[PDB]
Symmetry: C3
């Protein structure tokens, strides 16, 4: 493994794998149907990331994109991961607050646009246009963060204190960690090329494990996930 970023791909694979097994074991026995939804969503998220980390580690999830005069290593498997795991994370938030279905559809669809335009930007061979896709994807992310802070103002007169409390923490966790991903992309291998791929891969590893396994530990340890 002649790619120096292999260690972070291996560590990411192991930590997503271990978080999947932990959440699997923890959700055994659970009969509350509301809690079963949260365990299924929250366990699927690092299970999908485990498979995509492994595909990067083994090289399957890596391709070379010509741009800027250069053959650029691009890990496309990250977008196949995020396509599914970032709407699932939004679904955990949305279920906490009993979101209306129109709000869930706005969130999941804005998130698909965010990930799909991120992927088009990652694979685009004209260097300047990569950053046009980055901006569109960021605009979709900002929409999602707007909805998470301002789209549930009908949900407060009626929201169990423990649901509000856990939703607040997870929403803060989300806004901080997810906002770092466009920055990493912009300065890393896919963007300006200021931070080398080895470091980029480290940064996404720490973000992903926090946003998936850290997030899910907070959620699944709360009694907000059970019907009262």
């Amino acid at each position: 493994t002649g790619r120096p970023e292999w260690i972070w791909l291996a560590l990411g694979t192991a930590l997503m794998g271990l978080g999947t097994l932990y959440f699997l074991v923890k959700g055994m026995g659970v009969s509350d149907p509301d809690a079963k939804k949260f365990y299924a969503i929250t366990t699927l998220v690092p299970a999908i990331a485990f498979t995509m980390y492994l595909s990067m580690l083994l090289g399957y999830g890596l391709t070379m994109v010509p741009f800027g005069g250069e053959q650029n290593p691009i890990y496309w498997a990250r977008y196949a991961d995020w396509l599914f795991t970032t709407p699932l994370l939004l679904l955990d938030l949305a279920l906490l607050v009993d979101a209306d279905q129109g709000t869930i559809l706005a969130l999941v669809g804005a998130d698909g646009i965010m990930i799909g335009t991120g992927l088009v930007g990652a694979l685009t061979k004209v260097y300047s246009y990569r950053f046009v896709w980055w901006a569109i994807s960021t605009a979709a992310m900002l929409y999602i963060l707007y909805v998470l802070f301002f789209g549930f103002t009908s949900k407060a007169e009626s929201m169990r204190p423990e649901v509000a409390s856990t939703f607040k923490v997870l929403r803060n966790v989300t806004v901080v960690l997810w906002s770092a991903y466009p920055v990493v992309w912009l300065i890393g291998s896919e963007g300006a090329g200021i931070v080398p791929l080895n470091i980029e891969t480290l940064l996404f590893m720490v973000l992903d494990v926090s946003a998936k396994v850290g997030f899910g530990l907070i959620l699944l340890r709360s009694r907000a996930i059970f019907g009262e």
Copy 2:
């Protein structure tokens, strides 16, 4: 931009972009959960088309398919657009009439078959077989149009007059505009090659903007989208 169809890709990009912003602004403030569903579906549709028009304009959504002795320019991004936006359009219709879930699943699944076989036909290198996929996809479209006219005969004893009225108009808009897409494909660059790609791109632009932004203006201006 040495592709003469660039002007229609640019115009399509702008009109889908402007229709997205208009519907975004128009749906601000809306609290009625039924109306929020219609705004989310109807706003996502031109937002997705904006991204796919832009990918065609920038060249990312174009590939060359050998067939007929020739390297043929094929805009595959149209199928990535339609994969999502044509079930969303069907969902707006189906929600208007309070469709049963089995009818929604038939519609969304027939539509996936329509778009996916359209894409296989667009990328098929044996010329005669392209038209086998065209026929299968047309058969799926005809099924969808059948369901839209004859699959909601339990929904009339109970259907607000304004819902019936808006559903009738949008269903007519749909049947007329969607039926033109197999014809354009059959005579255009993907099919018989009778109409040049520049004109084909113009035709799909006018159809798409009408079927997305025209459709959505009719829907979102009606009080059929609000619970009574």
Copy 3:
């Protein structure tokens, strides 16, 4: 058709096509909304398989994957089929028993992991790593079979005798036929290469037609699909 497996691809195409038309005709007239769900799911399943069998027959769904020193014919279209039809089959089971939504999401997501890791294994160029993906996919299949036997223990105090009976038979049909697919893959063209592709294609044809058209005949002939 210089591929000896063409006959089984042609036969599979015809049998999925004929089963689609039969289920289409059989579900005409059905007004019971619960029954309409089962007809839509169960009819879409062989309709999707018909398109994917046809794409294999015509060669579109075939690619060459280098591994083991060799250019290996890999029918990738099977994974595009299964991506949709295996969650749909699980949905028919889950609706029979009135599964909780968290259980449905676990099933559909485990199934996506099963098919997507199966596809990564089928396309992986390092021979030994193909079998790592096979094992992960098998682990997801075993999870699905676990849930089908042990995830509905809240659903028995309340389950119409005819629903229990039909669910039991279809679940047995599923466990036996689906468990054969990793074995065929492991000994066939995608794995160890012990069984030639011609025979492999025969085996998957018999499995698919049984698991789709055989399964659906059992389901759609039962009164378990109607609300009582």
